[PDB]
Enzyme design. Structure first.
Site, short mmCIF file in Angstrom:
data_model
loop_
_atom_site.label_atom_id
_atom_site.label_comp_id
_atom_site.label_asym_id
_atom_site.label_seq_id
_atom_site.Cartn_x
_atom_site.Cartn_y
_atom_site.Cartn_z
N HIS A 73 38.48 36.61 51.52
CA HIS A 73 38.99 37.82 50.89
C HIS A 73 39.54 37.49 49.51
O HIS A 73 40.43 36.65 49.37
CB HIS A 73 40.06 38.47 51.76
CG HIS A 73 39.75 39.88 52.10
ND1 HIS A 73 39.91 40.91 51.20
CD2 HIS A 73 39.25 40.44 53.23
CE1 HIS A 73 39.54 42.05 51.76
NE2 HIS A 73 39.14 41.79 53.00
N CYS A 118 32.53 39.08 45.20
CA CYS A 118 33.48 37.98 45.08
C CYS A 118 34.57 38.28 44.06
O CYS A 118 35.30 39.27 44.19
CB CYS A 118 32.75 36.69 44.69
SG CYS A 118 31.65 36.03 45.96
N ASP A 155 44.02 44.32 46.86
CA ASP A 155 42.96 44.01 47.82
C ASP A 155 41.86 45.06 47.68
O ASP A 155 41.64 45.92 48.53
CB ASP A 155 43.53 43.97 49.23
CG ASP A 155 42.48 43.63 50.26
OD1 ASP A 155 42.24 42.43 50.51
OD2 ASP A 155 41.89 44.58 50.81
N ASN A 204 35.04 47.63 47.35
CA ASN A 204 34.09 46.53 47.43
C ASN A 204 32.76 47.10 47.90
O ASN A 204 32.57 47.40 49.08
CB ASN A 204 34.60 45.42 48.36
CG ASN A 204 34.54 45.81 49.82
OD1 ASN A 204 34.94 46.91 50.21
ND2 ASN A 204 34.02 44.91 50.65
C1 LIG Z 1 33.88 30.77 46.55
C2 LIG Z 1 34.37 30.32 45.17
C3 LIG Z 1 34.56 31.53 44.24
C4 LIG Z 1 33.49 31.48 43.18
O1 LIG Z 1 32.38 31.92 43.40
N1 LIG Z 1 33.85 30.93 42.02
C5 LIG Z 1 33.24 29.71 41.52
C6 LIG Z 1 34.34 28.67 41.42
C7 LIG Z 1 35.47 29.16 40.51
O2 LIG Z 1 34.93 29.41 39.21
C8 LIG Z 1 36.60 28.14 40.41
N2 LIG Z 1 36.09 26.85 39.92
C9 LIG Z 1 35.89 25.85 40.80
N3 LIG Z 1 35.43 24.64 40.44
C10 LIG Z 1 35.13 24.33 39.16
C11 LIG Z 1 34.65 23.08 38.80
C12 LIG Z 1 34.36 22.81 37.46
CL1 LIG Z 1 33.75 21.19 37.01
C13 LIG Z 1 34.54 23.78 36.48
C14 LIG Z 1 35.01 25.05 36.79
C15 LIG Z 1 35.31 25.35 38.11
C16 LIG Z 1 35.82 26.67 38.55
O3 LIG Z 1 36.01 27.59 37.72
C17 LIG Z 1 36.00 30.47 41.07
C18 LIG Z 1 34.89 31.51 41.18
C19 LIG Z 1 35.58 29.46 45.35
C20 LIG Z 1 35.35 28.14 45.71
C21 LIG Z 1 36.42 27.27 45.90
C22 LIG Z 1 37.72 27.72 45.74
C23 LIG Z 1 37.95 29.04 45.38
C24 LIG Z 1 36.89 29.92 45.19
ZN LIG Z 2 40.80 43.67 51.80
#
Ligand SMILES: C[C@@H](CC(=O)N1CCC(O)(Cn2cnc3cc(Cl)ccc3c2=O)CC1)c1ccccc1
Ligand SMILES: [Zn+2]
Ligand SMILES: [Zn+2]
Length: 330
Positions: free
Chosen positions: A250, A16, A267, A11
């Site tokens: 993480h 992310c 990881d 990393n």
């Molecule tokens: C911190 C982020 C990680 C990240 O930056 N990300 C953006 C969010 C994700 O794409 C998942 N996701 C979440 N909500 C959505 C809503 C609609 Cl309407 C359409 C598609 C999505 C979608 O894809 C994962 C990647 C995260 C937040 C909440 C839970 C887990 C991870």
């Molecule tokens: Zn780690």
């Protein structure tokens, strides 16, 4: 690296989900070999995603120490701090696949991306007053599922294809028939060999409710026309997970690269064996860590996607350019 035979990625910043996605694409063997045969001879040094992606895969297949992604990020220009916080994971998968797909045009492997990730669906509008129906064919590479109030993947698919009623103040403009009562929905025409499913868990706040997904998932119930020659049976291949208070966690991913049920945790630079329960049921949520994207492979095409790849599957010209760059660093 030595305990599992697989090497993780270091990393280098706040990337992310990036490192998690790369391992998933790397273990898509059928896709991996296609990128090795990409004509990246006269591409830019550090301004070509296809070339920069080729290097990562090669280093992953050969190197014994954690691999880096600094050159890759600059390839598509996401060097800002909040770059990844403003993009969905599927947005990066699309950005990556579009770049290699365009660079593969006219070769022996042109169109390999649609062959693995491309599917066909139909959106329609049907009204019960008159007899006007409007259908629209579309293509999809990733599926965004809703999980709020949904028990498992089965219910999520049921809500995805569920019909919507356009009545009352939401009547449909039936053109020559004026405002009309109708219903709108979508149907699945085909399912690609590799299935990417993102879980709508970020609705500006992360939701950690319990969501169940099986190791084997039958999707014949959601197809317009079934095919007894090849059922819509999919096998779980990769599970991307995340744990955090709405703004930081993480990012770990679980994989069984050969599709045999032998799972491993990634990881970043630490790869180690793990039980199937730790990779599946332990990520349902309900702790406080939960998965946000799933990868499924068609049971009938499992061997084709995960075919064996050796050092002979890389062109000699690319190996020298990659070795010459690593050697030049010495
Ligand atoms: C911190 C982020 C990680 C990240 O930056 N990300 C953006 C969010 C994700 O794409 C998942 N996701 C979440 N909500 C959505 C809503 C609609 Cl309407 C359409 C598609 C999505 C979608 O894809 C994962 C990647 C995260 C937040 C909440 C839970 C887990 C991870
Ligand atoms: Zn780690
Ligand atoms: Zn994707």
């Amino acid at each position: 690296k030595k305990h599992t035979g697989y090497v993780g990625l270091k990393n280098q910043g706040a990337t992310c989900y990036m490192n998690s996605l790369l391992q998933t694409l790397f273990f898509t063997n059928q896709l991996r070999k296609a990128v090795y045969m990409m004509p990246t001879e006269g591409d830019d040094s550090s301004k070509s995603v296809p070339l920069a992606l080729q290097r990562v895969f090669y280093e992953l297949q050969h190197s014994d120490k954690p691999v880096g992604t600094k050159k890759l990020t600059k390839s598509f220009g996401w060097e800002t701090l909040d770059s990844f916080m403003q993009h969905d994971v599927q947005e990066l998968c699309r950005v990556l696949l579009d770049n290699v797909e365009n660079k593969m045009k006219g070769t022996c492997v042109e169109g390999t991306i649609p062959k693995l990730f491309r599917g066909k669906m139909v959106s329609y509008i049907q009204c019960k007053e008159v007899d006007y129906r409007s259908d629209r064919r579309e293509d999809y590479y990733d599926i965004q599922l809703s999980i709020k109030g949904k028990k498992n993947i089965f219910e999520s698919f049921v809500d995805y294809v569920a019909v919507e009623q356009l009545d009352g103040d939401n009547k449909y403009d039936a053109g020559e028939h004026g405002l009309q009562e109708a219903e709108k929905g979508v149907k699945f025409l085909t399912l690609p060999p590799v299935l990417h499913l993102q879980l709508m868990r970020f609705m500006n706040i992360k939701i950690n409710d319990r969501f169940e997904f099986p190791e084997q998932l039958p999707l014949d119930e959601f197809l317009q026309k079934t095919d007894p020659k090849d059922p819509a049976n999919y096998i779980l291949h990769a599970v991307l997970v995340h744990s955090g208070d709405n703004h930081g966690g993480h990012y770990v991913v679980y994989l069984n690269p050969k599709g045999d049920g032998k799972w491993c945790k990634f990881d970043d630079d630490v790869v180690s064996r793990c039980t199937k329960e730790e990779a599946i049921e332990h990520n349902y949520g309900g702790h406080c860590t939960n998965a946000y994207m799933l990868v499924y492979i068609r049971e009938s095409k499992l061997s084709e996607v995960l075919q064996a790849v050796t050092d002979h599957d890389i062109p000699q010209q690319l190996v020298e350019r990659l070795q010459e760059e690593k050697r030049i660093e010495a």
